[PDB]
Design a protein around this ligand. Structure first.
Ligand code: NDG
Ligand code: NAG
Ligand code: FER
Length: 260
């Protein structure tokens, strides 16, 4: 359930999305030069933040969600109450992170309006959803919803908490071709002993979807494992707890400042 090292191509990509995610906490800092900064996703009450972006070179429309950036967002973080994903009925028996569902429904229509706004102009462009931490769970639920409308949807998360229950994980796995890593459209990136991917407890009914990409220090394509299956391994097995050093820094870039 683990293979060490990934292509140099995939590594760059992961580093690329990590960058965009980490920059979402500082007004999309120094994101690649080929991407256009677009419409702002925002709901002052849940303080959900994010942007719809477009890269005409890679031919993809990117949707970024910032991670916890306030006390308001933190209220969302702490709420582990399981709740049905009623916005996507076709996801049989699926239940997601309560606080994150709260954030999700607070922007769903806004998020779907803006996504469609770009997709309607660029039918052939791929749709990528990404984010770090709370922003990562916000991406997963978004990806899932989008999956039922568009076909070319990709998800790249970072330090993503367990966003829902096993049911939710299956839908995601089937929706994003997780059965195989060579075909996966859902990349769940983890780092060292990051504590967030261990929350909330699996015991409480939560579970992870997607194929895991565990970045180990010193980070590099060769120090990145491909974790598949259901056996305690990689990040989930390092015993990381809550928000620690590993969580805030992915591929040498921290959420705050813009080292990049
Ligand atoms: C289990 C639970 O409390 N679910 C409710 C959901 O039914 C409701 O639509 C939403 C709106 O506030 O709040 C919660 O998510
Ligand atoms: C105080 C609060 O916001 N708690 C919410 C609750 O209202 C919601 O019903 C549940 C399901 O998503 O998630 C919790 O986080
Ligand atoms: C999913 O649960 C949690 C997530 C965070 C995330 C913090 C961050 O991104 O800075 C903090 C506490 C939590 O209980």
């Amino acid at each position: 359930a683990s293979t060490q090292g990934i292509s140099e191509d995939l590594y760059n990509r992961l580093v690329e999305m990590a960058t965009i995610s980490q920059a979402a906490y500082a007004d999309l800092c120094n994101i690649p030069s080929t991407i256009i900064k677009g419409e702002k996703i925002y709901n002052a009450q849940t303080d959900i933040n994010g942007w719809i972006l477009r890269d005409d070179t890679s031919k993809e429309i990117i949707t970024v969600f910032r991670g916890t950036g306030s006390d308001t967002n933190l209220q969302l973080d702490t709420n582990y109450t399981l709740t049905p994903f009623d916005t996507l009925p076709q996801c049989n028996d699926c239940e997601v992170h309560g606080g994150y569902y709260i954030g999700w429904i607070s922007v769903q229509d806004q998020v779907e309006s803006l996504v469609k706004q770009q997709a309607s102009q660029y039918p052939d462009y791929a749709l990528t959803v990404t984010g770090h931490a709370l922003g990562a769970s916000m991406a997963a639920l978004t990806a899932a919803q989008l999956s039922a409308t568009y076909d070319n949807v990709r998800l790249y998360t970072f330090g993503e908490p367990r966003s829902g229950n096993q049911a939710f994980a299956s839908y995601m796995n089937d929706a994003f071709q997780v059965s195989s890593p060579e075909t996966t459209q859902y990349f769940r990136v983890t780092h060292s002993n990051d504590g967030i991917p261990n929350l909330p407890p699996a015991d409480e009914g939560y579970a992870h979807g997607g194929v895991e990409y565990w970045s180990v220090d010193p980070y590099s394509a060769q120090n990145t494992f491909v974790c598949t299956g259901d056996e305690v391994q990689c990040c989930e097995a390092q015993g990381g707890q809550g928000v620690n050093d590993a969580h805030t820094t992915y591929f040498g870039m921290t959420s705050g400042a813009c080292t990049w």
